[PDB]
Design a protein around this ligand. Structure first.
Ligand code: ZN
Ligand code: ZN
Length: 58
């Protein structure tokens, strides 16, 4: 499930952040509001962050 929306996601939009399919829209980081193209995923405490914003913040 997409823990941001609370909505179950499956193979169609299944982009696995934290071992679970998120919405590709929410396969993002909420810092910038940027959706990530399938990859570019970095998990931090259950929250998804862009590899770009990761390099900026961390
Ligand atoms: Zn979502
Ligand atoms: Zn971001």
């Amino acid at each position: 499930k997409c823990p941001r929306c609370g909505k179950s996601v499956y193979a169609a939009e299944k982009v696995m952040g934290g071992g679970k399919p998120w919405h590709k829209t929410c396969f993002r980081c909420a810092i910038c509001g940027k959706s990530l193209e399938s990859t570019n995923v970095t998990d931090k405490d259950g929250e998804l962050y862009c590899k770009v914003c990761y390099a900026k913040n961390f």
